[PDB]
Every structure is written in C-alpha cells, then in structure tokens.
Amino acid sequence: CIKCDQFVTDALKTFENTYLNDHLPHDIHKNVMRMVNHEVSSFGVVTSAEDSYLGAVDENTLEQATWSFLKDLKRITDSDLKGELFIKELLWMLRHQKDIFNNLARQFQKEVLCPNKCGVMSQTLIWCLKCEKQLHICRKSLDCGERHIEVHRSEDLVLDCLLSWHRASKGLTDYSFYRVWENSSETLIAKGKEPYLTKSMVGPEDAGNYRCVLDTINQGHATVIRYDVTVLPPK
Ligand SMILES: *[C@@H]1O[C@H](CO)[C@@H](O)[C@H](O)[C@H]1NC(C)=O
C-alpha cells in the first residue's frame, strides 16, 4: 500500500531525480527505477491462499509501513554505497521493507482487524492494489449479551453500553437507551453520543429490563446490550 502514500511517491521522485546521480551512473538509472517501482508496486498485492491478508490494511498500519520504508530509503540515500553494492543493498532493502510490511499487515489482522466479538464494526481500510479506501464491515450477531444490574434503592443506576472496539469503529451515530416493558413494548429513554445512561434516585418502578442499541450512519445497528435491573432495598 506504500505506493498509495504521497510521501512514498514524492520520496521516490526525489530519489530518482536527485539522489541516484550521487550513487550510480546516469545510464543505469531508469532500469534501476523500473525495478524499484516494480517492487514498491508489489507491496501488499495478493497471491490468493493466505496472501489475502496483505490486500488491505488500515490507515495507521499503512502509515507505519510508509515511515519505515522512508527511513530505509533515506539510509541508502545517505550511504557511501555505489555501483553494484548500491544496487544489491537497494533491492535487499526493498525486499526487507516488503517483509516489514507483511509483518505489519499480519499483525494488523490478528489484533486490529475485526476485534469485535459481537455486533457490527466499521473499519477504514486501504486496498493496496487499486489504492482504494473502503469501509470494511466486521459483522457478528448484533446482540452482545445481557447484563444483570443490581442497585440499592435511592442509588444511581448506570447502564454502560461502551465496548472496547467502539472508540475505533467508524460511522457511529448516537447510543439509544430503551426501557423494555413486561407488555413487550419499549420506550426510548435516552439518545445521544454518551455511551452510558444514568438514572438518579431509582425506585422499584425503575426495576425492569433495559436495552441499549448503537446506530450507524449507513451499515446499521452496531451493538445491542440488554440489562436486567433489580432494585434492592436501601440497606
Ligand atoms: C405497557 O404497555 C402500555 C401500552 O402498550 C404502556 O402505556 C404502559 O406504560 C406499559 N406498562 C407496563 C407496566 O407494562
């Protein structure tokens, strides 16, 4: 994906136009660049089987790849290497940066990608072949689970709808908190960007089932959490 970052392409433009003259004879420049560009364009391109894990990467990981690649390309720019050794080390550095990228993508999937164990997440991915930003939808069963909440009388009742991955998810609209009646109907008791609901000075009338549903601009509901609230005596 590094080809998708303006800093990499500008870096290669300066490398070809300015820095190559220092290291190598002019007449071998173009061919060298061809190879360089070829290798830089092969970054992240998928061979099927497992390789699909390199076809797309989040903006942050693309940033890491960009900056390590630029670090090495600058190292070689500043090296005393020339001729055959400069070419050998250049191609080796491209192969090594390709390894670094592969590691960053593999890692990105293991941890960063589809971290949600429930609900629907939306992550901005860069597809490396065409350099296209798309919204990747990690879709799992919308209902995340049921919380058993117990609160003494005249205390604060807090319903926490926040999930780990929520902060990272894209396109989140407001959380909506509903009260689910024994009659099998519900009324919205709150809506807004706050991940939680607070009800003050609860009483037995507040005992019951509650529900939290997070909404998105496009994809749908991101998360649902149900709450079973039992009001205890004051002491
Ligand atoms: C049940 O439903 C009715 C209308 O369907 C609603 O007005 C009422 O407040 C609800 N209350 C209980 C205790 O079920």
Numbering used by the authors: 22 to 256
Copy the relevant paper text.
In mammals this process critically depends on the interaction between Izumo1, a protein exposed on the equatorial segment of acrosome-reacted sperm, and the egg plasma-membrane-anchored receptor Juno 1, 2. Juno and Izumo are structurally unrelated: Juno adopts a modified folate receptor family fold, whereas Izumo1 is a type I transmembrane protein consisting of an extracellular region of about 300 residues and a short cytoplasmic tail. Izumo1 is not considered a fusogen per se because it cannot induce membrane fusion when heterologously expressed in commonly used cell lines. The molecular mechanism triggering gamete fusion is unresolved because both Izumo1 and Juno lack sequence similarity to known membrane fusogens.
Here we report the crystal structure of Izumo1, which reveals a membrane distal region composed of a four-helix bundle connected to a carboxy-terminal immunoglobulin (Ig)-like domain through a β-hairpin stabilized by disulfide bonds. The helical character of the carboxy-terminal half of the Izumo domain, which corresponds to helices α3 and α4 in our structure, was shown to be important for the function of Izumo1. The structure readily explains why mutation of leucine residues to proline interferes with this biological activity by disrupting the fold of the four-helix bundle. Strikingly, structural homology searches revealed a high confidence match between the four-helix bundle of Izumo1 and that of SPECT1, a secreted Plasmodium protein that is essential for host cell traversal by the infective sporozoite form of the parasite (Dali Z-score 6.9, RMSD 3.3 Å over 98 residues). In addition, the β-hairpin of Izumo1 is structurally similar to the extensible β-ribbon of TRAP, another Plasmodium protein that mediates sporozoite gliding and host cell invasion (RMSD 1.4 Å over 19 residues). Our findings suggest that the four-helix bundle of the Izumo domain and SPECT1 may orchestrate analogous fusion-related molecular recognition events at the sperm–egg and parasite–host cell interfaces.
